[PDB]
Amino acid sequence: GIVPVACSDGYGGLVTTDPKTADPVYGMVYNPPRTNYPGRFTNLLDVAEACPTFLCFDEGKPYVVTRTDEQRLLAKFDVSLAAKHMSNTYLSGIAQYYAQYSGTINLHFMFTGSTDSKARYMVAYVPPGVETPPDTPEKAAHCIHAEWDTGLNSKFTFSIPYVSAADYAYTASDVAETTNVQGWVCIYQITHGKAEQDTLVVSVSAGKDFELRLPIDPRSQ
Amino acid sequence: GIVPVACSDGYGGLVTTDPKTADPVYGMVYNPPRTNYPGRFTNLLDVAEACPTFLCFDEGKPYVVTRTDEQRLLAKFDVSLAAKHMSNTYLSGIAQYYAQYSGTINLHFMFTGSTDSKARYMVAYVPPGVETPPDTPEKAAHCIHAEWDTGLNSKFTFSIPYVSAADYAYTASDVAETTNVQGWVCIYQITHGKAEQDTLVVSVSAGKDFELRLPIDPRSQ
Amino acid sequence: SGNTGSIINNYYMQQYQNSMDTQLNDWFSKLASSAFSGLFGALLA
Amino acid sequence: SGNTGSIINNYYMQQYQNSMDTQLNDWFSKLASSAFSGLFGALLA
Amino acid sequence: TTTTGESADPVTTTVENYGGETQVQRRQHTDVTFIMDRFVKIQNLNPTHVIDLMQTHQHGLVGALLRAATYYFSDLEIVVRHDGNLTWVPNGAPEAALSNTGNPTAYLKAPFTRLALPYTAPHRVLATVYNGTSKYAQLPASFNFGAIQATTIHELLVRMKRAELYCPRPLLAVEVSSQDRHKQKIIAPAK
Amino acid sequence: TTTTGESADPVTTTVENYGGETQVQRRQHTDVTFIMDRFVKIQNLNPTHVIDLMQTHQHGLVGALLRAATYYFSDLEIVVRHDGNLTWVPNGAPEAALSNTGNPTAYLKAPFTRLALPYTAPHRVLATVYNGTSKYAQLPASFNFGAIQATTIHELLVRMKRAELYCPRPLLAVEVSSQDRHKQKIIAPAK
Amino acid sequence: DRILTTRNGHTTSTTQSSVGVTYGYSTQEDHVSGPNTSGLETRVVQAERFFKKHLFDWTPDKAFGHLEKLELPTDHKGVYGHLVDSFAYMRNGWDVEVSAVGNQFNGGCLLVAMVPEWKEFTPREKYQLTLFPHQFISPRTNMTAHIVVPYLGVNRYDQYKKHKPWTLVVMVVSPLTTNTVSAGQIKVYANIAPTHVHVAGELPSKE
């Protein structure tokens, strides 16, 4: 006799993400060598950590600037990978293909003023729980925040912390959510000295524990 | 119970080059012995290396000849397994069944003149990069080349080197390529003495590192 | 390697299942690992 | 042997799968290996 | 963290700077080989079709990630729904060869044919962009994985195996006009 | 390299003569057993058909390579698409035997029948050319792999197993009139 | 140490306002002797030296995104240029210095990047040019950017008359600002040296 088998209903159909391999048909192909080809990346997040890309502020500028030397909110944006301000970043370009994330997002601030222009800035992370973001540095001081001034080192980096009820958050934003589920980042100018036409360039990168999970194919095709 | 299996969609069809074997139906057949039958070849390139076959020049002659004792281009041909001049060779007969090759192609020159006829020849490999092949030995001298004269040894062999951008080259030639992708071989007569009716027979064989890969069945059937 | 999870070997030899690489390196991993962290200067914590 | 790449043995015995050879050699390999290379004469390199 | 921004040296600050604690991360889903290893549609088909990964959709998961690399290498699997027998020829073959049985030819077996194919280009890696010409914009004709032919080709899926990507390039999310966030309907239970 | 051409001794010069370096070569694809080991069509069919490899097409990959050898040996696999049951008889059988079930007979099972057959000729090797007569041009009638019969034979593919070839003979590419190169459409990506 | 001297052949460049050297994609070259040149390639050190090119004038009116590019190799009238005409195949990396001399009273910022296989970037893609090997030039900090890249490409050797693997890109990130004590515009120049120059396949003479 031979081996009896049960061909099982519900199994065997092709699934586009299945973990099996096809049968081969053309063997013994040896490839040209590509030993040590430069610029290889094996994980998207290595690239996302190492290469910050620019945020987008009013009028498509990767920077904020202010002409008054008074304290002011220079920018406010949703802590969301779907935020308008993050829409041209590499981090958001990658995140659209995953349903969830957790971990740190790093913001980078680079001052480009002349040597005779000085300023003092503040960045605050405002968690969900208030109706509108604080409009002054004084109200925002009660949040997790950092203040810094300009000098020899033109760059300051700050980690936006992952603080949420659930262990993961959605990368996309739903039509029903009015105020952002993950809070806001507010950037203020405390004051400046002769910095009217000078700018602060802002970029973003993935933090050490930033993580994306659950691959999805969401764009209109 | 018995073993449950998933008969998988997309598998099981016959593929003409599959790596499996059919079920047998007529066993125990012993063959007449054929121990040490002569003339066996196990790789086509052993034959192609050991047995040079003739090139084809104007009017279907396996040789070039010249009546003037002046320096002249005796022949120019494309370094292509699809070249007119190579069309009756065993090397091209084999190469038509593979999509790609790399490695050395060897040219053989055999002088058949009488004892009182002498000549000096030159062969040059002209890589791609110039519009037309050089018409004189002087212009071609700047290329990889060899010069030799006739004497007791009637045969001279020269390796056409594989020099290209990619690691493999196509054996066939496309309708769109005007000047040959791999360059040209130019054969010149530097001068001769009383060699007006005497000929130089040319043949070709595979070099030590010549290689053909990716079997194809291209002829009209 | 990749998105495959059969506990059992492949019925076919590797020379058939895939092309074979020949020889004659993760740049971004090195780049990311090399990033500066911490501060710069003097801390008063 | 040839164009086959199953990692696993054949379910059938060889006496059934193929004919069996009896006894009572690669000429072209020898011929090609025996070819002269290099030059002839005296080199001034 | 404070630094010289102009040097462009990577800097990765952490929440420890203000008293937080960096967590564990598991990045298997953003591993390159893993993410490219799934079937995607090719879409613009003909009975004679040259397999070119650049025909994947530019915003699809695989097509977008592929375009976010300059050079790549991979083996391939294809699923083809076709009428008649399907023949495949390697990179470099004369188009005429597609008519012959001596080339890998799969006899029709419903519902479609799935095959594993090796990389067959003459180059050590392929590119998604090529700044120059190949003749003696577009990509050189030699950037392909062979060609297939059947009486009719209804559908074609490709899957990159053991993919390698080199030299990252821009990858864009949808542009946002909302002024705050791109919002869309996320799946949620009925009633 | 300089030599006596008349002796016809093999001579294989290398690029080292002028300062180059000979590379590594991988010749698996030109291995004889490997290259002959694939299915090809037979084409001129009848309900009663004697299996003769010389009925392969003379320019097909297998047919041309077979004709480029004088003697050969191999076992065989066949794929037959037929109506009715298929019977096979070995080399030497009376044609009448094709009507009986006691000879290997395959009962129809869609879409076709695939079988492994042994070499059954009375000679130690077969030949592709035979300079003489066999009766007391053509090849002796004993040069065959048996015969098959079915109500209708729609298609027949043969595959040489563990092939051995002896004494090479001419193998020709297409003749060229272009005066420079035979040019043809090589596969290239669309648009 | 802000003072750097770079030497390429019998040419040197010294800068007192540098922020270091950025290496792109690798700190060494792939193998220069592969199967495609059959051991016939050779190195030409006489070509490994600095040549110069003016890129553009950075003026206050150029806005964010303004991009200037230089495909390499470019027209070269020296030894390197003769190689392009005398050999069929070549390969080399690049040692690139870009300078933008104004004074410290100017403000603004330029992105200097080396891009493999150039293609015209859309405005949205410009926000991600930092994915490529780069440095910034910002008058308050430096006047010089310095990037070193290896040869790369689908082919181990190239025909530069048909393909240019690398493109030097300079993009305005933040516009140039001026004062009564600043420069009014900044002329941007490139000081470039080909590295590890190898050629193969000598061509016939044109006459």
Numbering used by the authors:
A (entry chain C), B (entry chain C): 1 to 221
C (entry chain D), D (entry chain D): 15 to 38, 65 to 85
E (entry chain A), F (entry chain A): 1 to 136, 156 to 210
G (entry chain B): 12 to 218
Provide the publication's sentences verbatim.
FMDV is a non-enveloped single-stranded RNA virus belonging to the family Picornaviridae. During assembly a 95 kDa polyprotein (P1) is cleaved by the viral 3C protease to yield VP0 (36 kDa), VP1 (32 kDa) and VP3 (27 kDa) which self-assemble to form the capsid. The structural proteins are arranged in an icosahedral lattice of 12 pentameric building blocks which are the major structural intermediates for FMDV assembly and disassembly.
Initial production of empty capsids utilised infection of mammalian cells (RK13) with recombinant vaccinia viruses that encode a P1–3C expression cassette, where P1 (derived from FMDV A22) is either wild-type (vA22-wt) or carries the H2093C mutation in VP2 (vA22-H2093C). In situ room temperature X-ray crystallography was used to determine the structure of both wild-type and mutant capsids produced using vaccinia virus at 2.2 Å and 2.9 Å resolution respectively. The crystals were essentially isomorphous to those obtained for both A22 virus and A22 natural empty particles, and refinement, using strict 15-fold non-crystallographic symmetry and real space averaging gave reliable maps and models for both structures. One group received A22-wt and the other A22-H2093C capsids.
